[PDB]
Point group: C2
Chain length 101, copies 2
């Protein structure tokens, strides 16, 4: 949808991958549990973009049940992009607050 | 710059035009005073997009000194887009808070 929405899920997906190495299915479920109730296969295109951008990397390893899944973890560029995100989020939040009132 | 940043200034520019009918120069100055210190002619491309999108309209009328300036005011679509913005901003703020902690 909107530029704002895309910016937020980028930062959020990047942050989640930073906290814990996650595969595609478990990222969508973590996203839903955070409040993204209404996300329809719209997440893996973003994961595809980030991997190709060399922000994250996908490596095959065993999930907790025992099938191999592609786990995403942050690259050097990705952990910079998420620190950028949190600084930009903190900055824009206080700006928006000021305008609102 | 980023998708997040673009989304924020869109909403903010739209909101400012809603509060008070403004021309290009005075919008940039209102934006700087809100915290956008480091915005370089990057604002008028956005105003151009919104006018063409029929979200805002530009009409020529006298500024407080007496020269005619193009004042931007919200169209029917624009005032919907800003209510959408504030709902989306409120929604994403509480989601991001939840993920952060």
């Amino acid at each position: 949808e909107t530029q704002l929405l895309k910016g937020v899920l980028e930062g959020c997906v990047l942050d989640m991958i930073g906290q814990k190495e996650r595969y595609g299915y478990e990222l969508v479920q973590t996203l839903r549990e955070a409040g993204f109730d209404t996300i329809v296969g719209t997440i893996y295109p973003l994961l595809q973009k980030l991997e190709k951008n060399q922000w994250i990397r996908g490596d095959m390893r065993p999930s907790p049940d025992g099938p191999d899944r592609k786990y995403f973890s942050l690259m050097k560029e990705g952990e910079e992009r998420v620190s950028v995100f949190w600084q930009q989020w903190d900055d824009l939040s206080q700006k928006v607050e000021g305008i609102k009132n």
